[PDB]
Amino acid sequence: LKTIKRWLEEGATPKAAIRRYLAQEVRPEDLGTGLLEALLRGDLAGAEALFRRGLRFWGPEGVLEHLLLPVLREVGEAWHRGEIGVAEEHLASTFLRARLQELLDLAGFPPGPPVLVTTPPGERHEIGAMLAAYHLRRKGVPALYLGPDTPLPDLRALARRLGAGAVVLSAVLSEPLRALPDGALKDLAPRVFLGGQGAGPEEARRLGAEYMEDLKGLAEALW
Amino acid sequence: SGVYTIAEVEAMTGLSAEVLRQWERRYGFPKPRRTPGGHRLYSAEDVEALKTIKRWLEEGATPKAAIRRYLAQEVRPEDLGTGLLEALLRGDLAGAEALFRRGLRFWGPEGVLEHLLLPVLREVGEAWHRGEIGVAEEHLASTFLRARLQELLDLAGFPPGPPVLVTTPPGERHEIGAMLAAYHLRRKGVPALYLGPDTPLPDLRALARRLGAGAVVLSAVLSEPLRALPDGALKDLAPRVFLGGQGAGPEEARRLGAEYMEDLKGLAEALWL
Amino acid sequence: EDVEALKTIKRWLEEIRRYLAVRPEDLGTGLLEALLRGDLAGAEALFRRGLRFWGPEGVLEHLLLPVLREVGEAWHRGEIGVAEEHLASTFLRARLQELLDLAGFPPGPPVLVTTPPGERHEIGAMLAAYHLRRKGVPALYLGPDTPLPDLRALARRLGAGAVVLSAVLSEPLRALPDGALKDLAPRVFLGGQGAGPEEARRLGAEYMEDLKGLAEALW
Amino acid sequence: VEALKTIKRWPKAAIRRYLAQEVRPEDLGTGLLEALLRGDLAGAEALFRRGLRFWGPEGVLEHLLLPVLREVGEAWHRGEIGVAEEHLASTFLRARLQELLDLAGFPPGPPVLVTTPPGERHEIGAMLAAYHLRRKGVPALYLGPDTPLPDLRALARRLGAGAVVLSAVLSEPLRALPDGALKDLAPRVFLGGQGAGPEEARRLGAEYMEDLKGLAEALWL
Ligand code: B12
Ligand code: B12
Ligand code: B12
Ligand code: B12
Ligand SMILES: C[C@H]1O[C@@H](n2cnc3c(N)ncnc32)[C@H](O)[C@@H]1O
Ligand SMILES: C[C@H]1O[C@@H](n2cnc3c(N)ncnc32)[C@H](O)[C@@H]1O
Ligand SMILES: C[C@H]1O[C@@H](n2cnc3c(N)ncnc32)[C@H](O)[C@@H]1O
Ligand SMILES: C[C@H]1O[C@@H](n2cnc3c(N)ncnc32)[C@H](O)[C@@H]1O
């Protein structure tokens, strides 16, 4: 309303002033909060609209790192502090996953020997794996995202049968990795990659997988 | 079923006899039958085909390409289910999507669910249980089909007004039945807010209060998570509480204090009125 | 169709929010009608709606292409002016550029995509680039109207494995000397409404009928 | 110290992340161009995003997009780079501007048709104008370049467009137009760009606008 008065003082007409203020889009720095606030009140439309802005503004990889991830992290912290309930997190996570799934389907899927992407048994956090899949696809790697929580014998069978060149695992929790016997990941695929918040160099060496710090290097390692 | 002479076809289609003769020789179409009278006769489906082909030519297609297109054999609707299953099982996302696209085009949104998405999901479960396929295979199929359902979900409207929370009982990780419920409700103009699976009842009641949710819908694929709940556990989740799914039943729903719904079609009528 | 709307609401009543919350067969028309009245908002929504139903490639074949042809025909018939077509083309081109940017761009020796000199229809080239991108080929779309000496230089310097040309008009191809496309790149691909096998053989490029075969061709 | 204070504000992984966060703004221009010229779309995209995050939407245009374009022009003119190279850079940079354009709002109400005079194929300045208008709440309809004046005049009539804006990068297409050719395109007709000038605009019966900042104000009031 202060801005509107400012525009009126500049010689603008009230009709023009009101229309301009309403037609005003949300500042990029505010996209994170806006997207979070939109989800918490069940405004899926506004949320989808806001994510789309960030996509155009930051780009595909950019909006994940600058919007999708920060919102999820804040959702996690708010829950741990007890500031939001589980249903709220569910709402945001399910949504943000749908967006990531769209981006994934829009990326190319090259032919040739696939790279199986998933999370270790007991890991139900799947978005980190989708990030891995998406970055690989964006770089021309036929990343086949299976979904999360795949038994090692079943994972090994698929990689053999499809002749997969590699397997990539995302560990958000460290407990499922620690619950695995030594060398559990060794013969999953010709190359085995382990990364994620719950992963580290020492634990990967124990399980017989190659540790990857960031997603950028994951692509270079494969190509 | 020959009914027209090449002279007659030239008059109807506007294509010269030389051209029609040439395309037959060069591309194998059209093929008029030869009568005992010796005349070579084109069918009514040859004329309409050539009218269509000619339109494609005017749009810039080459005769070879147009004819190849008209003739091109697509996958039969009855084989779409099998084809989609086989496509997923070899890690052919491209083929799998093309097949789902075709089925969606052929059956429509609700149609493709009953004729393709649901049958394939059911079959994947049976295949795993018989040891025919592994968990990784099933994971792949479910993730794919969930993405398709999410598209349809997003393609349906999201009406304003007090939402209807859709989720699964605590301990239930099968979410497609819930997405499916949300989808049917959106198609009928009801703002179904799908939360994802496995939601604690207190948190569920809290959100329903805060958003002023008019109703809550639960999908129970397994019966064990329902059995783990005390009598009347679902009573005060929302002003109205709905329970459905293979793991749900009228008796069990009555015990938990929820309204039981057999089919998704009837779920809409309960909410819409 | 505001009157027909009130009729539909009454039918449900005999048994408003439902009515406010589009059939796929009508997406083509709706998208065109929106553009023709300058409703970019409505247009963008309908394309995205079309996108989610047909998929990336599908919405191009079932929505982008039919609309453009109708725009082209309407222009010829005198139904619409050049200004209308301009609006529609710019919009649809923007959508394809989005899809193009949204698909991956793999590393390794690029494939240069453009049109022959004098060819200013660029969307077909974007279509070719896009299909290659979707199948994991590093398609570098340059834009239209690239002089052959310049195109050849870029391909040499970047070590491009191939060059792809889209010809919508056949005249700019005819204006080229025999074998003009021979030494552009290790492989040279020619396709489009204005291209044909004979003209391609003459210019020394490999003729490609459909975009599907173009991806297969590079492997 | 101010750098070190910022670095502290931003354990093993953190040091690599915090330190590699800084990048000289002045070097963004060259880096973006070099990225394009070797066909590195990934790097080019990354560099543009970095600059877009640093300077903002309006900022990245003046400090990155426009300077690069001009340099591409200079590089070609000196024989340094080929036409194919320039083509590549422009298409990329157009995509970015097109993104920024659609990112800005499209307000309701009578549109403003934006294009170039017939024979003008440089279109970025025209997009730029559409961008600047939209950001100030004016419903700028960008048509694309090279629009016949009668057709332009017809569309403006049908949509009840309040104004027409023309971007002239070359002066020849303006010189090729008859007196008063731009007079009745729309209730208001605006001509600007490196190929435009006050006297020439005056001849064609259009209002001359020096810069894009003032173009919005003319319409906003
Ligand atoms: C959504 C969510 C859930 C959802 C999952 C939804 C789904 N289907 O994915 C549900 C509700 C199922 C859930 C459950 C639980 N979760 Co939870 N959840 C989250 C939340 C909010 C976001 C999850 C997410 O995907 N975020 C995005 C993640 C993946 O990003 P990121 O790890 O930073 O990833 C980066 C890098 O690691 C890289 N990366 C990822 N994968 C890979 C792979 C490779 C190869 C490479 C190179 C890099 C790489 O990509 C990113 C680049 O920046 C997080 C909060 C948080 N801090 O992340 C909590 C969080 C992870 N969850 C947590 C907890 C406690 C749980 C539960 C135990 C809760 C409970 N008591 O039931 C269960 C565990 C179930 C299980 N076994 O998985 C804690 C973990 C605490 C800990 N000790 O580590 C968190 C941190 C919340 C908190 N603040 O306390 N959760
Ligand atoms: C995919 C899948 C999974 C995925 C889930 C993916 C996901 N995120 O949703 C994963 C891998 C996680 C999984 C795990 C498990 N699953 Co499972 N899974 C399936 C599968 C193949 C389909 C799941 C699905 O959503 N299908 C769609 C279903 C719901 O369709 P439908 O039955 O025809 O349902 C209709 C109606 O019920 C209606 N409906 C559903 N919800 C609602 C709600 C309302 C209100 C209304 C009105 C109607 C309605 O919708 C349909 C309309 O026609 C099913 C097989 C099957 N037939 O369902 C097995 C199945 C359900 N799972 C099974 C099992 C055994 C398990 C596991 C215990 C396996 C294990 N040992 O680890 C775990 C349990 C996890 C848990 N805690 O919940 C068994 C169930 C055994 C039983 N009869 O008790 C099945 C039947 C497989 C089998 N044949 O053995 N599973
Ligand atoms: C938009 C448009 C323009 C815009 C272009 C904007 C832009 N930046 O692209 C502008 C305004 C520049 C324009 C100008 C002209 N155009 Co015009 N234009 C059109 C329009 C409406 C659509 C063009 C389009 O994008 N089509 C979509 C493309 C993708 O279709 P397609 O080429 O058939 O592509 C398919 C296949 O060929 C394949 N393909 C394409 N490239 C490749 C490459 C490979 C390797 C492979 C395998 C396959 C492949 O991809 C598609 C798959 O379905 C068409 C109408 C129409 N019917 O196409 C007229 C049309 C093409 N134009 C036409 C004309 C006459 C002109 C002008 C001469 C008008 C004039 N007098 O100035 C000028 C010529 C400019 C020049 N010198 O090149 C005529 C051409 C007729 C002819 N051949 O003589 C058409 C058909 C209009 C009409 N008469 O109805 N045009
Ligand atoms: C990219 C490009 C092209 C591309 C255009 C792609 C496209 N789709 O738009 C193509 C390949 C088509 C091209 C062709 C040609 N071009 Co050229 N091109 C350029 C380049 C590198 C950038 C053009 C651009 O978009 N600039 C960005 C604009 C925004 O910058 P600006 O003009 O300074 O604009 C500012 C102000 O004027 C204001 N402004 C602009 N519009 C408006 C409107 C209003 C109302 C207002 C208030 C303000 C305003 O906005 C900006 C604010 O800073 C320039 C280099 C340069 N120095 O500009 C050469 C340049 C413009 N081109 C040039 C030439 C020679 C040509 C060709 C003749 C080459 C040829 N032989 O074919 C043709 C002409 C085609 C035609 N009929 O128009 C010369 C012009 C020389 C001259 N004689 O004046 C330049 C200057 C290059 C050079 N240094 O030699 N070109
Ligand atoms: C990591 C995420 O796990 C979710 N979370 C915590 N407890 C439960 C539960 N009982 N059921 C389901 N999800 C739960 C929270 O929403 C948190 O954000
Ligand atoms: C019902 C579905 O449960 C999946 N399933 C079976 N065992 C496991 C497991 N250990 N972890 C995750 N999913 C499993 C199978 O893929 C089956 O299809
Ligand atoms: C192929 C498209 O080219 C456009 N078109 C036709 N004539 C001209 C011209 N003189 N200048 C610019 N564009 C033109 C029309 O809008 C047609 O649909
Ligand atoms: C102003 C811009 O025009 C481009 N340019 C110069 N000559 C041609 C041509 N024959 N065809 C296409 N573009 C050309 C150059 O790439 C220059 O940068």
Tab-separated table of N, CA and C in Angstrom, chain A residues 48 52 55-56 60 99 102-111 134 137-140 223, chain C residues 44 48 51-52 56 95 98-107 130 133-136 219:
chain	number	residue	atom	x	y	z
A	48	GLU	N	3.399	-24.831	-7.220
A	48	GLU	CA	3.861	-25.246	-8.535
A	48	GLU	C	4.292	-24.037	-9.350
A	52	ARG	N	8.232	-23.209	-10.608
A	52	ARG	CA	8.450	-22.933	-12.024
A	52	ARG	C	9.255	-21.655	-12.227
A	55	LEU	N	12.813	-22.460	-11.438
A	55	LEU	CA	13.342	-23.260	-12.531
A	55	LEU	C	13.839	-22.364	-13.655
A	56	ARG	N	13.009	-21.408	-14.045
A	56	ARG	CA	13.380	-20.483	-15.094
A	56	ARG	C	14.515	-19.582	-14.641
A	60	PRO	N	17.615	-25.804	-14.464
A	60	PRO	CA	17.267	-27.135	-13.954
A	60	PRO	C	18.082	-27.549	-12.724
A	99	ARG	N	8.008	-32.786	-8.613
A	99	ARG	CA	8.706	-31.814	-9.440
A	99	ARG	C	10.004	-32.386	-9.958
A	102	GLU	N	9.359	-34.847	-12.712
A	102	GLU	CA	9.064	-34.182	-13.972
A	102	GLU	C	10.346	-33.796	-14.688
A	103	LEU	N	11.264	-33.186	-13.945
A	103	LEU	CA	12.531	-32.747	-14.518
A	103	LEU	C	13.299	-33.928	-15.110
A	104	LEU	N	13.232	-35.050	-14.406
A	104	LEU	CA	13.904	-36.277	-14.788
A	104	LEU	C	13.360	-36.814	-16.113
A	105	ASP	N	12.037	-36.815	-16.251
A	105	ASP	CA	11.395	-37.315	-17.458
A	105	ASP	C	11.654	-36.404	-18.651
A	106	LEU	N	11.933	-35.133	-18.367
A	106	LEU	CA	12.181	-34.143	-19.410
A	106	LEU	C	13.618	-34.199	-19.921
A	107	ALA	N	14.520	-34.736	-19.108
A	107	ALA	CA	15.903	-34.919	-19.534
A	107	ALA	C	15.976	-36.060	-20.536
A	108	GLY	N	17.057	-36.124	-21.298
A	108	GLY	CA	17.186	-37.191	-22.271
A	108	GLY	C	17.453	-38.517	-21.585
A	109	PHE	N	17.093	-39.614	-22.245
A	109	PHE	CA	17.494	-40.944	-21.795
A	109	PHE	C	18.200	-41.670	-22.936
A	110	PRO	N	19.529	-41.537	-23.000
A	110	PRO	CA	20.324	-42.187	-24.048
A	110	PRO	C	20.227	-43.710	-23.984
A	111	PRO	N	20.395	-44.385	-25.129
A	111	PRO	CA	20.472	-45.850	-25.163
A	111	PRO	C	21.802	-46.352	-24.614
A	134	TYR	N	19.318	-37.613	-12.027
A	134	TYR	CA	19.079	-36.448	-12.868
A	134	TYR	C	20.393	-35.879	-13.406
A	137	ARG	N	21.740	-38.143	-16.139
A	137	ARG	CA	20.971	-38.031	-17.371
A	137	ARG	C	21.267	-36.720	-18.101
A	138	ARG	N	21.298	-35.621	-17.349
A	138	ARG	CA	21.649	-34.314	-17.904
A	138	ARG	C	22.992	-34.344	-18.623
A	139	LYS	N	23.859	-35.268	-18.220
A	139	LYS	CA	25.175	-35.409	-18.824
A	139	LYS	C	25.263	-36.606	-19.771
A	140	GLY	N	24.117	-37.145	-20.174
A	140	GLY	CA	24.104	-38.160	-21.211
A	140	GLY	C	24.338	-39.587	-20.750
A	223	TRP	N	31.618	-41.017	-17.499
A	223	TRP	CA	31.916	-40.728	-18.906
A	223	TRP	C	33.393	-40.939	-19.220
C	44	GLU	N	0.370	-20.706	-22.581
C	44	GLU	CA	1.455	-21.389	-21.902
C	44	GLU	C	0.909	-22.535	-21.063
C	48	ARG	N	1.624	-26.636	-21.591
C	48	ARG	CA	2.058	-27.442	-20.455
C	48	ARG	C	1.071	-28.566	-20.202
C	51	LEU	N	1.778	-30.873	-22.880
C	51	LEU	CA	3.040	-31.523	-22.565
C	51	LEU	C	2.842	-32.750	-21.689
C	52	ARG	N	2.139	-32.559	-20.577
C	52	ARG	CA	1.927	-33.616	-19.589
C	52	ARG	C	1.100	-34.781	-20.108
C	56	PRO	N	7.089	-35.072	-23.992
C	56	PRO	CA	7.899	-34.070	-24.693
C	56	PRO	C	7.757	-34.139	-26.209
C	95	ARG	N	8.917	-22.273	-26.341
C	95	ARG	CA	8.567	-23.499	-25.658
C	95	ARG	C	9.554	-24.613	-26.014
C	98	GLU	N	12.836	-24.136	-24.384
C	98	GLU	CA	12.732	-24.569	-23.002
C	98	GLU	C	12.955	-26.067	-22.888
C	99	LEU	N	12.239	-26.827	-23.717
C	99	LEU	CA	12.357	-28.279	-23.713
C	99	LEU	C	13.775	-28.686	-24.071
C	100	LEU	N	14.359	-27.940	-24.994
C	100	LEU	CA	15.714	-28.187	-25.442
C	100	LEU	C	16.691	-27.979	-24.289
C	101	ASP	N	16.510	-26.893	-23.551
C	101	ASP	CA	17.385	-26.591	-22.424
C	101	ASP	C	17.155	-27.593	-21.284
C	102	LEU	N	15.930	-28.101	-21.181
C	102	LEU	CA	15.548	-29.022	-20.116
C	102	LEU	C	16.073	-30.435	-20.339
C	103	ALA	N	16.199	-30.838	-21.597
C	103	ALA	CA	16.876	-32.093	-21.909
C	103	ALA	C	18.356	-31.931	-21.612
C	104	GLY	N	19.064	-33.036	-21.471
C	104	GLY	CA	20.474	-32.939	-21.159
C	104	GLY	C	21.297	-32.457	-22.336
C	105	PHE	N	22.470	-31.899	-22.049
C	105	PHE	CA	23.462	-31.639	-23.084
C	105	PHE	C	24.771	-32.329	-22.731
C	106	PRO	N	24.944	-33.567	-23.219
C	106	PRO	CA	26.109	-34.426	-22.972
C	106	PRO	C	27.417	-33.831	-23.482
C	107	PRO	N	28.544	-34.190	-22.845
C	107	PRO	CA	29.881	-33.814	-23.316
C	107	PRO	C	30.326	-34.631	-24.535
C	130	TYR	N	16.618	-31.296	-30.780
C	130	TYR	CA	15.940	-31.779	-29.589
C	130	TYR	C	15.888	-33.306	-29.543
C	133	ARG	N	19.245	-34.602	-28.698
C	133	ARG	CA	19.470	-34.350	-27.280
C	133	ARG	C	18.752	-35.383	-26.401
C	134	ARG	N	17.478	-35.637	-26.697
C	134	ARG	CA	16.681	-36.601	-25.943
C	134	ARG	C	17.248	-38.013	-25.983
C	135	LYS	N	17.984	-38.334	-27.040
C	135	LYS	CA	18.582	-39.660	-27.153
C	135	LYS	C	20.074	-39.615	-26.809
C	136	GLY	N	20.488	-38.539	-26.145
C	136	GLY	CA	21.825	-38.441	-25.580
C	136	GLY	C	22.936	-37.940	-26.480
C	219	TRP	N	24.629	-43.439	-34.024
C	219	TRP	CA	25.269	-44.561	-33.340
C	219	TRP	C	25.617	-45.669	-34.331
